[PDB]
Amino acid sequence: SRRWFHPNITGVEAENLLLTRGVDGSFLARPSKSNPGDFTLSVRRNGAVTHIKIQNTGDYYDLYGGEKFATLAELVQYYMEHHGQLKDVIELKYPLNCADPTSERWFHGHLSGKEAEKLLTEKGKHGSFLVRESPGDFVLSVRTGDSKVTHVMIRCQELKYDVGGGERFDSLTDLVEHYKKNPMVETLGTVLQLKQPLNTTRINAAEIESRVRELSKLQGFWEEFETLQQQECKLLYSRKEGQRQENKNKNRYKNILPFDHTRVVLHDGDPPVSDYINANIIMPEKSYIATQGCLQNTVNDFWRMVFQENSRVIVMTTKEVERGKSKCVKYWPDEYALKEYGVMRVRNVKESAAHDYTLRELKLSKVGQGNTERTVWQYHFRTWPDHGVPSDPGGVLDFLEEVHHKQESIMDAGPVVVHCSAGIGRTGTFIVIDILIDIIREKGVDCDIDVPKTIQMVRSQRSGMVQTEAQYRFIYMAVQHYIETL
């Protein structure tokens, strides 16, 4: 679970919460108020509260006096298993759980009963349910059949929740979780199965502008993005291969690792431990490989991956050096030059500069086998800001449009390789826009798109794909711009 995350608390509320309801080792995380876009890990230690800053400009969660992580859940899980790592040590022993339901998928808050019935009727199925605010009370609305809608009243009596009888709960989450395991049974046999929360994020593509406007009001974008973040706790899949000793210096950031079930396994085999790259296959529902920026010691592994997967198009979404820091080593030769990267050979045939990007025409082949030669097109997006996202999606859209046609013109082309520094933020953003635009491209303006469903799907294949709310908003803005210029 991710109950240690409190989305609506100030730093003072967090101090009093940990001092009165926690013990030494109690902790919580929360979004920042003094610097929006940042986070605060508040820990109780020796009767006093320490506030540790977490920064995310779009690449990773950078914990102050700690490490870099793909998700807040991966960060908490790491310190809850590796003690003595956070510093004079700071121990994360006891999560202080959040009773606030704002980030619940099923919680809607302000929503009338007619709006809820209209939502459950037009968008629901058997087991679809939601919870809305009633004068301090709530209403649980559930659909049953193959059909009807039932309204269960949720009373708040002395800071506890109940449906009229039986158990009293500390939160609406604890009530929902209980009636999900132990369903309410109606008089004449109807089982109020709370199978899945009502989907309200799936929209018809033609209505993107209306949704963006609703999300822009005082912000709707923030609730939807934080609701999506609460679902990351379900994606703590194993990353054991990336943790192995012989693979540790093959990772740009030691805690941002590929999921074992989706990682690209290398078979070029130079015999003891030659099967690892910090990369993952991303399959929608065209494929992708989401990867980190090369290190000097992984350049050969990268070209072995490109060759093995039959990839013909690489999308690089970072400059090699940003803010004085190496983000990706130069893994391609200078123009007209030929270089050998282990058993692989690469010639840079031609470079073409465009306003936002540079295209490099590369020829890749295995040393000793000329018949293995294929052209690999490297699209190097150069104008993405050091922090945040572009103010207009036009540049990224024209770039993705070009990348798409190059990929479509190559018969039997393998997955498109996408990379930034950690391979999760700009990488996830570029891939999610390309997925949503591929839907609107094939199935026209009369199609159903679901931005958080698409992100959750890509996040189960690589940790923390799409890092910030600014990127998430950029995705909505990019889909919108694509649809408007159609």
Ligand SMILES: C[C@@H]1OCC2(CCN(c3cnc(Sc4ccnc(N)c4Cl)c(N)n3)CC2)[C@@H]1N
């Ligand atoms: C107070 C707010 O009221 C509305 C609310 C925000 C928008 N809503 C919403 C619902 N579910 C998700 S995650 C998701 C979506 C679709 N497929 C999958 N697979 C996932 Cl994981 C999301 N990002 N936003 C409805 C709930 C908030 N509670």
